[PDB]
Amino acid sequence: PLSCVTRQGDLRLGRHLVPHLFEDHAAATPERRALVYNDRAYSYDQLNRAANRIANRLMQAFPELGTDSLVGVRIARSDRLALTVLAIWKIGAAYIPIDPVLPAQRMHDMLDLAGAKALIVDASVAAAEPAVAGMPRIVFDDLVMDDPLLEDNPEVHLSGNDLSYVLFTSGSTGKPKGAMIEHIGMLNNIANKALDLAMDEDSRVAQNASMSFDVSVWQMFIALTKGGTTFVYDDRVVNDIAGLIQRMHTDSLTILEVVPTYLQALVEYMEEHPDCPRPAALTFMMVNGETVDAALLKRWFALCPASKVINAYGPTEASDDITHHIMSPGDEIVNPVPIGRALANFDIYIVDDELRPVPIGTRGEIVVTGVGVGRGYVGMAGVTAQAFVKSPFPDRYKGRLYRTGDLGAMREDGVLMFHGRK
Numbered sequence: 280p281l282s283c284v285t286r287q288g289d290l291r292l293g294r295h296l297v298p299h300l301f302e303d304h305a306a307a308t309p310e311r312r313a314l315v316y317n318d319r320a321y322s323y324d325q326l327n328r329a330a331n332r333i334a335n336r337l338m339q340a341f342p343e344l345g346t347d348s349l350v351g352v353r354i355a356r357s358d359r360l361a362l363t364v365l366a367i368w369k370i371g372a373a374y375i376p377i378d379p380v381l382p383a384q385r386m387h388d389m390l391d392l393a394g395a396k397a398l399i400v401d402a403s404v405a406a407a408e409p410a411v412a413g414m415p416r417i418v419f420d421d422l423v424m425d426d427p428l429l430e431d432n433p434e435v436h437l438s439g440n441d442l443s444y445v446l447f448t449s450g451s452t453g454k455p456k457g458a459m460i461e462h463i464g465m466l467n468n469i470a471n472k473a474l475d476l477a478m479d480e481d482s483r484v485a486q487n488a489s490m491s492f493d494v495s496v497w498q499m500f501i502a503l504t505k506g507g508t509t510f511v512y513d514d515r516v517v518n519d520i521a522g523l524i525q526r527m528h529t530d531s532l533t534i535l536e537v538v539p540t541y542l543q544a545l546v547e548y549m550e551e552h553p554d555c556p557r558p559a560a561l562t563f564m565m566v567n568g569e570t571v572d573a574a575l576l577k578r579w580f581a582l583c584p585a586s587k588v589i590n591a592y593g594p595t596e597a598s599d600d601i602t603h604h605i606m607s608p609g610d611e612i613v614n615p616v617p618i619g620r621a622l623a624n625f626d627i628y629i630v631d632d633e634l635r636p637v638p639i640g641t642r643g644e645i646v647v648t649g650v651g652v653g654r655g656y657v658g659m660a661g662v663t664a665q666a667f668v669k670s671p672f673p674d675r676y677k678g679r680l681y682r683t684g685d686l687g688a689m690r691e692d693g694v695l696m697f698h699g700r701k
């Protein structure tokens with residue numbers, strides 16, 4: 280057999296994109312708790328109304344904003360960030376996360392490469408730093424002000440193929456590359472995760488990742504598509520392991536995603552302080568981003584025996600993950616830990632340099648087609664052409680193929696194994 284797994288078309292995604300699923304819940308159950316950020320709690324209705332005031336004031340200030348318009352957002356992770364992103368999506372536009380800690384020259388490159396039409400900051404950022412001529416800047420605090428006449432849904436038409444966000448790399452070499460992600464790819468990642476994490480209206484999901492990382496998107500919004508609650512854990516909280524663990528206990532958190540080094544810090548703390556309260560409501564811990572090892576996973580399972588663990592793998596360019604490896608405490612967990620099974624609506628291949636699939640068990644490049652393959656890198660046609668190419672394989676979407684630059688191999692059962700960088 281050849282190293283091919285095909286799941287294009289496997290999962291129906293429903294009629295509604297992410298912002299509209301949130302709107303559905305706000306209409307059906309307005310008083311459910313939607314989002315908590317430290318001392319601030321919003322019901323679905325409060326969050327929706329505030330996002331609508333922002334959206335309507337944005338359309339007043341920028342009447343030409345809409346489909347594929349890119350808006351920079353330089354607001355720290357918070358209720359304010361969630362509200363601003365939701366507002367941008369409601370008016371048909373897409374956003375670029377620009378963490379306030381990033382220096383001005385990085386902001387400039389991100390806005391310039393993206394052709395951004397405007398920048399939204401919060402009051403603290405506006406007071407610390409000047410606007411730049413030619414880049415309209417508007418302030419969250421003004422956009423969100425009370426006005427009961429501005430609280431209805433904008434009801435702008437959104438298509439699945441429209442951009443939802445552009446996420447720039449944050450390495451130490453070259454100009455940053457801004458991956459273009461579309462609403463339908465973002466939705467597909469969320470739909471797969473909601474199923475594999477067994478989510479429901481009682482789910483309580485942590486938003487702990489930096490806004491410079493694409494995983495912060497599904498973390499912020501997945502619960503809002505299900506009637507559950509997002510808990511935003513900012514940098515001050517995440518930097519205090521003891522404090523984050525206590526918060527997860529008090530909040531009865533059910534879903535947490537981390538990288539392996541942070542997982543290690545959590546495991547070490549709980550092993551060193553067995554008297555302390557633990558995240559006993561967690562149903563799933565997801566680890567992603569770098570290679571995880573079996574011994575660390577088994578140490579986690581000893582501490583959180585009621586949880587399952589997902590090893591999640593994929594590139595930002597394909598809307599977050601393309602494989603999930605689901606593990607239960609009783610499983611035979613050994614090194615190397617698999618990266619797992621293709622998400623629905625993708626096809627994954629292990630190929631040689633000419634994109635020819637290799638026999639099962641042979642190492643080659645991981646490449647992917649399907650609904651979540653994004654558009655490329657904004658303002659960079661050459662770099663785009665290096666990794667985004669026309670698929671030579673059957674396709675039911677837009678014919679896109681993404682070369683990950685990762686080496687891997689496929690087992691006979693279709694499970695994928697990660698073998699480093701090509």
Ligand SMILES: C[C@@H](N)[C@H](N)C(=O)NS(=O)(=O)OC[C@H]1O[C@@H](n2cnc3c(N)ncnc32)[C@H](O)[C@@H]1O
Pocket residue numbers: 493494566567568569570571590591592593594595596599600618683685697699
């Ligand atoms: C992972 C996504 N949830 C997230 N969107 C993200 O990390 N995107 S990414 O584009 O920034 O990095 C992607 C690059 O990291 C590497 N990698 C990612 N996961 C794993 C993993 N489980 N085991 C080993 N290595 C991994 C790999 O080399 C890969 O290509």
